[PDB]
Amino acid sequence: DIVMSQSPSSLAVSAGEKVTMSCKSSQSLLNSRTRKNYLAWYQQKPGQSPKLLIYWASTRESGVPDRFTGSGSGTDFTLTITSVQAEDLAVYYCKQSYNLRTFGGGTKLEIKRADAAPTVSIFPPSSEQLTSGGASVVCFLNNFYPKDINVKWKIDGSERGVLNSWTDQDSKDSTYSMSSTLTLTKDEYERHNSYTCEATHKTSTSPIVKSFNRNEC
Amino acid sequence: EVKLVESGGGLVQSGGSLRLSCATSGFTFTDYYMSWVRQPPGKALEWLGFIRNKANGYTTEYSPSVKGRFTISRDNSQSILYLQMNTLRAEDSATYYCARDHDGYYERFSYWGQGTLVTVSAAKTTPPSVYPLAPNSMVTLGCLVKGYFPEPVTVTWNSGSLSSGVHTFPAVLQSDLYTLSSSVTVPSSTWPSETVTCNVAHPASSTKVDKKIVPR
Ligand SMILES: C=CCO[C@]1(C=O)C[C@@H](O[C@]2(C(=O)O)C[C@@H](O)[C@@H](O)[C@@H]([C@H](O)CO)O2)[C@@H](O)[C@@H]([C@H](O)CO)O1
Ligand SMILES: [Mg+2]
Ligand SMILES: [Mg+2]
Ligand SMILES: [Zn+2]
Secondary structure: OOOEEEEOOEEEEEOOOOEEEEEEEOOOOEEOOOOEEOEEEEEEOOOOOOEEEEEOOOEEOOOOOOOEEEEEEOOEEEEEEOOOOHHHOEEEEEEEOOOOOEEOOOEEEEEEOOOEOOEEEEEOOOHHHHOOOEEEEEEEEEEEEOOOOEEEEEEOOEEOOEEEEEOOOOOOOOOEEEEEEEEEEHHHHOOOOEEEEEEEOOOOOOOEEEEEEHHHO | OOEEEEEOOEEEOOOOOEEEEEEEEOOOHHHOOEEEEEEOOOOOOEEEEEEOOHHHOOOEEEOOOOEOOEEEEEEOOOOEEEEEEOOOOHHHOEEEEEEEOOOOOOOOOOOEOOOEEEEEOOOOOEOOEEEEEOOOOEEEEEEEEEEEEOOOOEEEEHHHOEOOOEEEEEEEEEOOEEEEEEEEEEEHHHOOOOOOEEEEEEHHHOEEEEEEOOOO
């Protein structure tokens, strides 16, 4: 059958630098009759459908930036991105069409940038939720780099129903954001006063602390 | 302009059937092969099958992975592509894309639809609860879209007029329900003096919500 494999699984590269990724087929994709390699590259940015970049191994589709170049023949192919831009963040797939079609497993390209501290915001439960008997407290940690971050919840000063979610990297500023949601029952929420989220990120030995007090609402 | 638009995704039980459609325009439909491709959340693309063009008698081929279970067809009068799926299982949960394929010359999928999400599950449809998140030169507001099933939901702000400074956090499944959130950051001089509203939709439950963020 035709097995398509890609390398690396993932990598990070700084804006302006060169990216190299590879694609291997288990059979030569070189059609002897047309003398072309039936190998295409697609880019899939976060939340989007795939987009055609390159076909016949090296033909760049109209509208595709010149920085993208496809090369190779037979069983081995390469997509090279010169002077990578923040917007190039994506999963890149190769696909053979020599015999039906088969996709490789993709290469995830992330962008490396300077460390950035998060901006942290805390939000108390809404009255429209509390009326229902639940109480979710939300902290947004926005626009930071690198991706690793620690969030602690403290209730009346002691550490504590947590849902954490990271955005994909931003296509403009190459930062991450994360949301942390602590959910309590209304009964439990009303037993305590101070609600704190504490973000520790490599950008500071000081955690970023945001709090509210139920009595102040 | 070429347009490809999938429809028919949603929740279905294990063992059930579902038919997807893909409406097209902006090109000579009968000239082209059309493919179906799927993608489980966070996983690779998987080619499923194609239907050939008029010159090749509109014949079909399928991946061994779905041959015998999935059927592709096309309406050449209206330029619509179909995918009939039978005996669905959890592994079939995925975004399904149609893609324009071969025209007898070029080897490429020139265009892809936005995709339609299929979820194979015994769980019932549950509409979200949508809650406002209200509290510098900048201020950050949000909406908590809690406790829904299946995916997806859509979130915009001020009907899409606020897109810059928006972060929508991918849904997370906990105890059989999804929850997501979305933040928006605007100049403090503009809120609460100007209105800020998150617009949330949950197609599975036909839910449409506009939640104005009001200062507390
Ligand atoms: C293998 C069958 C006969 O080859 C061709 C002759 O040109 C090409 C066929 O195109 C396909 C196909 O429909 O299977 C699709 C195309 O993307 C590519 O994969 C080629 C493959 O390189 C073999 O040529 O196959 C098709 O036109 C076919 C026709 O149906 C019968 O002659 O003819
Ligand atoms: Mg941001
Ligand atoms: Mg207490
Ligand atoms: Zn307690």
